């Protein structure tokens, strides 16, 4: 249940998972993990 990526991201980046309705590009994020 995980995509494997060869390019496009670097390590330590913060992937958004939950909430792709209410998140358009450029919003504050209550970035929990």
């Amino acid at each position: 249940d995980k995509w494997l990526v060869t390019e496009g991201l670097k390590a330590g980046d913060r992937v958004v998972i939950s909430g792709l309705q209410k998140v358009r590009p450029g919003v504050q994020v209550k970035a929990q993990e």
Binding site: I17, S18, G19, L20, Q21, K22
Partner: protein
């Protein structure tokens, strides 16, 4: 001739009592429901093509069907969809008023124009063509308490035992399951087919062949040989009856018996038609009925027997199966069938209070207590010949009409009581001595009532079906409340009475009422000093009246023209909406939270949550889901904070905290397509053939443009789904056959592994149940599992898919809707809260001018109701205004004479408009009946006051200035006995809330504190309305 029934009086007595049981046979013949047939007759065609996306099932099923639909009768808007579970649901909203049964079959057997042109899986699965919209009677959740039964284990028990038995019960028209039943879910293990070098072809080709009932022949059959004595019938291969007997469905065997049983390549078990719906009821899995009315709506006998027939099933329940009702029509009206009778009995006493007010007698006061229960059940009886039903639009229509049957009851006994109380003559002649001058006026006591139904046939559509339910209710409250008031009630002034002294003002009356009956004398001189001082002020009270109506339209333009109020109907629907392409595990996990939220934070309000994963009224799938939420009776929860809107708005706040899901909720009417109460619902079209992505950029440009006008077009959302990813396989044809395969072997592999193919039926327990070959779960669950499917070459060497099927991702809208034979999208919308919809409808059009070629624009729902008529208030209540001018001019026998009775129309609507301030409700249809109930009786006092002034012009010859000064002074003692004769009937209409309060507390104070403008404030101006007519149009100069 009105006294033709009086010249032998009991010839009039008995005819009303004939109605008491010749209607009484028909009040038990009359069936009950909360709501009549409001909706326009829709036709829901539910095709199903399992395992195929939108653009397949738009093309294979929907476009083929929509090509045929040209030659049918009387459609409003043939709305559609086509989604990713393979379901079509085209909806033929027809014209209102025209029937369904003729109109259903005109679109049901020319679906047979191209039933062969549909693929022979969708016409092997279903095209079910109902004649019903979303008006369920009740939903019966069947629920496993223990956990032995799964979800789908419930559903065949509902199908094999309940669905037929519940549809036995009378009043039941349509029954669904959210199941449906145990289709033999043939799984496939593609690392076992490759073991035996098979495909999903040979699993199908066996099961289509080794499982088939054969026309088996008969021994000794037809003809016999001459000399035959034996006749039997052969049983050939029966349709196999077991998960174990499909286990030994044979496959390839060699010539030396090395068999391949199908249980070596299949995890055979029973399952469902589709697992697209995971229901849930308080955390544990449920199936469910959905029960609809039989046309000829029945709710007293149905739900009382739906429960009663269900009472023979708890001996037959398996381990922990329970039945629970997440929805029901009837407990809305299981209590109002008694209380609206019980409000009426005290309303009889409220009219017996009027007899107790001035008479204070015990034998001469039984006349209204017998005049009332004749009319109430005759009111059912004539509409029982119309065939209409007792309903919350009609029992409410006759809890008003028991104000409108008593307002003629205690004005014509009290006119008789008036005439006998200045010269003292007996009521045997006072029943004629009153009627001797107003015999052309008791054709007038319902004559503005003859003028307030003649456009009530003249409203069409959904709301046009509402006015008809008050139309024939105020015609039976016209007819058999006056045919017991012109005929019965003058004859009722003869027998049971205690006649009086020489003109009884009430000389020997001893009580504190009797001293207050000298404050009945406070308004004797003062109301004369009113009108005598209004006559001195007749120039400044003339010009005052046209500027107490400047607040009418000033309130009416800020009184928002809304629709029917959100009733606390005891349920509210909670919609979830996950990201694009979110699986059913996540949605159930979110519906774990939302159920845990509606339970463990609202135990007091929410009875339970019937939560379906995957169902969307917006459109089925896996990212959506609905939570039917059961509320409770108001005897279990108090207050406005426990009504629906307070529950839902607290819910949506905490739904900002639930990530990965755009959760919200809403409330339900009967129809779920009534708009946004400034409602427009919009179908933007593709015309040219631009595809859908060029139509999608139009959505991306106008939903953005809807978000560029927050001032007019407030909600920017489509009902459909965002363009989810969907997984293209390049079945590489040229590669595939050169590799050595055939193509029909590929697509029967690919379309019956990853899809799930119906094969044939089998027989479980003597019931015919489907057989679906499908890949197992863990082998069709990734793009990686493409390569695990093995397809047989020309020679029989196995070939993986990944050798010849490259793949790529792409978009696709997994719910494509259609304009009538062209693509479209369901754009919702609201005008900004407290504005008109006609400009919000028109702005969208001239914002669709910002959108390119090949794009039409049309409407649906209540918007096509708006497309035919914007508002039928100003010009089609002019025919409740001009039609009042023609009828009452026949009484006074003069042109411009009803211009006096036209000036109680503002003094009846201002009482209606002020009740929208002292409680704060909007303009709905029940406010539009709030006019006609209150201007219906502002005019009758404005007959009773100034038609006695016609006696003061055509029997008595006083001058019309002082005839009006006699139309205050001779009229004086009935003045407190006319205006207060009705307004004592409106008394229980304040402290009664719960289950639709604003029809009887805001319109209740539209008729308690709304009739005060028409009863204790209009009649100050009603006598000088006669002279402001008859000082400009004086035929006395």
């Amino acid at each position: 001739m009105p006294n033709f029934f009086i010249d032998r009086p009991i010839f009039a007595w008995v005819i009303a009592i004939i109605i008491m049981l010749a209607g009484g046979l028909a009040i038990l013949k009359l069936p009950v429901a909360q709501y009549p047939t409001i909706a326009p007759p829709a036709v829901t065609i539910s095709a199903s093509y399992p395992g195929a996306d939108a653009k397949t099932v738009q093309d294979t099923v929907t476009q083929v069907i929509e090509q045929n639909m040209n030659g049918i009768d009387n459609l409003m808007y043939m709305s559609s969809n086509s989604d990713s579970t393979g379901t079509v649901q085209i909806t033929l909203t027809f014209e209102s008023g025209t029937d369904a049964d003729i109109a259903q079959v005109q679109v049901q057997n020319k679906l047979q124009l191209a039933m062969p042109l549909l693929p022979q899986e969708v016409q092997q699965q279903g095209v079910s063509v109902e004649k019903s919209s979303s008006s369920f009677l009740m939903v019966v959740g069947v629920i496993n308490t223990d956990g032995t039964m799964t979800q789908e284990d419930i559903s065949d028990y509902v199908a094999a035992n309940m669905k037929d038995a519940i549809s036995r019960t009378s009043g039941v028209g349509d029954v669904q399951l959210f199941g449906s039943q145990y289709a033999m879910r043939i799984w496939m293990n593609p690392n076992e087919l490759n073991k035996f070098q098979l495909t999903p072809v040979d699993v199908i080709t066996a099961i289509k062949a080794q499982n088939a009932q054969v026309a088996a022949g008969q021994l000794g059959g037809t003809p016999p040989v001459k000399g035959q004595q034996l006749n039997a019938s052969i049983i050939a291969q029966t349709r196999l009856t077991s998960t174990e007997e499909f286990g030994k469905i044979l496959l390839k065997v060699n010539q030396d018996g090395s068999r391949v049983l199908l249980r070596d390549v299949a995890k055979i078990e029973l399952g469902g038609e589709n697992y697209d719906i995971i229901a849930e009821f308080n955390g544990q899995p449920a199936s469910g009925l959905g029960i609809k009315l039989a046309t000829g709506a029945n709710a007293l006998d149905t739900a009382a027997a739906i429960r009663a027939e269900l009472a023979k099933m708890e001996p037959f329940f398996p381990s922990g199966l329970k039945i629970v009702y997440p929805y029901d029509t009837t407990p809305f009206v299981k209590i109002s069938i008694h209380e609206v009778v019980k409000t009426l009995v005290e309303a009889i006493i409220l009219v017996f209070l009027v007899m107790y007010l001035f008479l204070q007698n015990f034998r001469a006061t039984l006349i209204p207590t017998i005049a009332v229960p004749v009319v109430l059940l005759g009111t059912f009886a004539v509409l029982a010949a119309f065939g209409f039903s007792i309903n919350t639009l009609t029992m409410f229509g006759m809890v008003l009409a028991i104000g409108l049957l008593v307002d003629d009851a205690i004005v014509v006994v009290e006119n008789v009581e008036r005439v006998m109380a200045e010269e003292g003559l007996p009521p045997k002649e006072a029943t004629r001595k009153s009627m001797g001058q107003i015999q052309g006026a008791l054709v007038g006591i319902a004559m503005v009532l003859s003028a307030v139904f003649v456009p009530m046939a003249f409203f069409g559509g959904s709301t046009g079906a509402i006015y008809r339910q008050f139309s024939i209710t105020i015609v039976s409250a016209m007819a058999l409340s006056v045919l017991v008031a012109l005929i019965l009630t003058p004859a009722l002034c003869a027998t049971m009475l205690k006649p009086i002294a020489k003109g009884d003002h009430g000389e020997g009356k001893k009580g504190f009422f009797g001293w207050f009956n000298r404050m009945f004398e406070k308004s004797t001189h003062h109301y004369t000093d009113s009108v005598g001082g209004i006559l001195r002020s007749t120039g400044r009270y003339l010009v005052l009246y046209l500027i107490i109506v400047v607040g009418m339209a000033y309130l009416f333009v800020r009184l928002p023209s809304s629709f029917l109020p959100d009733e606390d109907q005891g349920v509210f629907m909670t919609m979830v909406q996950l990201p694009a392409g979110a699986t059913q595990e996540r949605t159930q996990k979110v519906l774990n939270e939302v159920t845990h939220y509606y339970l463990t934070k609202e135990k007091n309000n929410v009875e339970s949550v019937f939560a379906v994963n995957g169902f969307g009224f917006a459109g089925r799938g896996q990212n959506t889901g609905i939570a039917f939420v059961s509320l409770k009776d108001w005897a279990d929860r108090p207050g406005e904070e426990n009504k629906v809107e307070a529950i839902t708005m607290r819910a949506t706040r905490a739904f900002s905290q639930i990530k990965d899901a755009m959760v919200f909720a809403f409330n339900l009417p009967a129809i779920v397509e009534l708009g946004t109460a400034t409602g427009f619902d919009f179908e933007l079209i593709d015309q040219a053939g631009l595809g859908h992505e060029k139509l999608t950029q139009a959505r991306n440009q106008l939903l953005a443009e809807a978000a560029k006008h927050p001032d007019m077009l407030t909600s920017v959302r489509p009902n459909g789904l965002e363009d989810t990813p969907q997984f293209k396989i390049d079945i590489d044809q040229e590669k595939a056959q050169a590799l050595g395969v055939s193509i029909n072997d590929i697509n029967t592999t690919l379309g019956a592994a990853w899809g799930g193919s119906y094969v044939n039926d089998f027989i479980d327990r003597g019931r015919v149940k489907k057989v679906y070959v499908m890949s197992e779960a863990k082998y069709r669950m990734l793009p990686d599992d493409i390569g695990d499917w093995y397809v047989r070459a020309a020679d029989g060497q196995m070939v993986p898919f990944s050798a010849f099927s490259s793949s790529r991702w792409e978009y696709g809208s997994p719910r494509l809707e259609r304009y009538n034979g062209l693509p479209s999208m369901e754009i919702l919308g609201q005008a900004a809260p407290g504005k008109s919809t006609g400009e919000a409808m028109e702005l969208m059009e001239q914002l669709a001018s910002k959108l390119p070629t090949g794009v039409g624009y049309d409407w649906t729902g209540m918007s096509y109701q708006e497309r035919l008529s914007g508002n039928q208030a100003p010009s089609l209540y002019a025919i409740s205004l001009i039609v009042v001018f023609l009828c009452l001019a026949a009484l006074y026998e003069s042109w411009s004479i009803p211009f006096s009775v036209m000036l109680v129309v503002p003094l009846g609507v201002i009482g209606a408009l002020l009740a929208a301030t002292f409680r704060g409700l909007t303009n709905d249809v029940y406010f539009q009946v709030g006019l006609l109930t209150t201007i219906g009786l502002s005019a009758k006092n404005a007959i009773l006051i100034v038609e006695f002034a016609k006696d003061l012009m055509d029997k008595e010859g006083k001058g019309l200035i002082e005839a009006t000064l006699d139309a205050v002074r001779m009229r004086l003692r009935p003045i407190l006995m006319t205006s207060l004769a009705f307004i004592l009937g409106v008394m229980p209409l304040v402290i009664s809330t719960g289950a639709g309060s604003g029809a009887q507390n805001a319109v209740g104070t539209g008729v308690m504190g709304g009739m005060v403008t028409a009863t204790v404030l209009a009649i100050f101006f009603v006598p000088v309305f006669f002279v402001v007519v008859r000082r400009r149009f004086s035929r006395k100069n």
